[PDB]
Amino acid sequence: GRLIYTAGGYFRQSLSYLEAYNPSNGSWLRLADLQVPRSGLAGCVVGGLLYAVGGRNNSPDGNTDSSALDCYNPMTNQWSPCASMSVPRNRIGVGVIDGHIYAVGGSHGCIHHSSVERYEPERDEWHLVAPMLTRRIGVGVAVLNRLLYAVGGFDGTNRLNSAECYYPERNEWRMITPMNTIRSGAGVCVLHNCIYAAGGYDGQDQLNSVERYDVETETWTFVAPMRHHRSALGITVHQGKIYVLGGYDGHTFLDSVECYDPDSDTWSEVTRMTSGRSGVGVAVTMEPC
Ligand SMILES: CCCC[C@H]1CCCN1C(=O)[C@H]1CCC[C@@H](c2cccc(-n3ncc(C(=O)O)c3C3CC3)c2)C1
Numbered sequence: 001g002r003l004i005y006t007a008g009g010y011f012r013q014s015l016s017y018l019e020a021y022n023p024s025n026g027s028w029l030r031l032a033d034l035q036v037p038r039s040g041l042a043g044c045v046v047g048g049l050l051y052a053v054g055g056r057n058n059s060p061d062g063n064t065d066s067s068a069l070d071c072y073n074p075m076t077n078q079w080s081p082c083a084s085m086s087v088p089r090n091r092i093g094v095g096v097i098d099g100h101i102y103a104v105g106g107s108h109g110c111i112h113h114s115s116v117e118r119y120e121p122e123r124d125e126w127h128l129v130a131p132m133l134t135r136r137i138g139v140g141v142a143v144l145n146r147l148l149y150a151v152g153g154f155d156g157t158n159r160l161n162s163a164e165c166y167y168p169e170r171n172e173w174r175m176i177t178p179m180n181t182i183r184s185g186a187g188v189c190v191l192h193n194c195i196y197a198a199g200g201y202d203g204q205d206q207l208n209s210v211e212r213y214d215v216e217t218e219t220w221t222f223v224a225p226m227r228h229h230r231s232a233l234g235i236t237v238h239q240g241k242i243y244v245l246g247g248y249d250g251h252t253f254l255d256s257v258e259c260y261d262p263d264s265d266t267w268s269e270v271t272r273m274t275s276g277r278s279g280v281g282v283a284v285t286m287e288p289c
Pocket residue numbers: 009010039040058091092137138139153154159184185200201231232247248278279
């Protein structure tokens with residue numbers, strides 16, 4: 001598309017911001033607020049519609065895990081509730097295959113989900129698919145060659161380097177090569193034939209390391225690290241370059257936005273969000289009106 005949308009997040013409380021960044025002119029642009037604050041959500045795009053999935057409203061007067069699926073139309077600049085998932089999912093992963101949205105893992109209270117469900121925008125309906133072999137909250141999700149990948153996260157006791165892959169036609173999950181670094185709450189995306197895992201939390205500190213999985217070779221290879229350690233960062237791809245947005249570096253909620261150029265293997269600070277925050281949902285689509 002054209003704009004990088006960031007929705008929700010957390011700073012002192014769950015947030016309702018919807019701001020769009022234009023990598024062509026460096027401009028930010030605040031849009032319609034989310035009807036319900038939510039952190040640990042995920043963002044995705046299907047047929048020009050932006051979707052905010054799961055999360056959790058950490059607020060003074062209470063904390064409520066969200067099973068919501070909200071939908072934003074850039075032409076109207078309006079949100080609209082859509083069908084709700086079977087189960088609340090905080091610290092969630094999502095991935096799009098054949099116009100369908102896969103909601104992966106997440107937490108509801110202290111229940112850590114292995115379950116997975118798929119949303120069909122044409123029927124406004126969810127349906128549960130096969131669960132993951134492992135419970136994963138704060139899981140990174142990526143789609144490559146119509147295959148879904150769940151990478152890292154937290155399973156209730158330990159934080160994981162493990163990763164697994166879902167083959168839709170079989171409705172089946174299988175382990176793939178684990179990462180070289182334990183990552184939970186990382187930024188996972190796809191670029192070319194590789195699945196990048198950036199930052200996260202490894203049980204002790206926030207990570208700035210970045211590695212990528214080559215499906216052909218089935219191996220993880222480290223790559224130039226980010227300039228800031230990050231956890232609960234937003235991540236997306238725009239014109240063959242990765243953008244990581246915000247996160248927590250261990251002491252401050254970052255407004256830093258970094259951009260990875262895979263041809264030069266370098267990271268550079270593109271801009272800075274209008275305020276520091278972690279746990280945002282990110283996606284990319286057309287400009288609004
Ligand atoms: C609710 C307020 C208190 C938490 C604040 C202060 C300390 C820091 N932090 C935040 O940045 C919060 C903000 C809300 C969203 C939070 C979030 C989003 C996505 C994934 C995860 N996630 N999933 C698994 C694990 C794990 O550790 O294994 C994690 C943690 C990031 C490592 C957490 C981050």
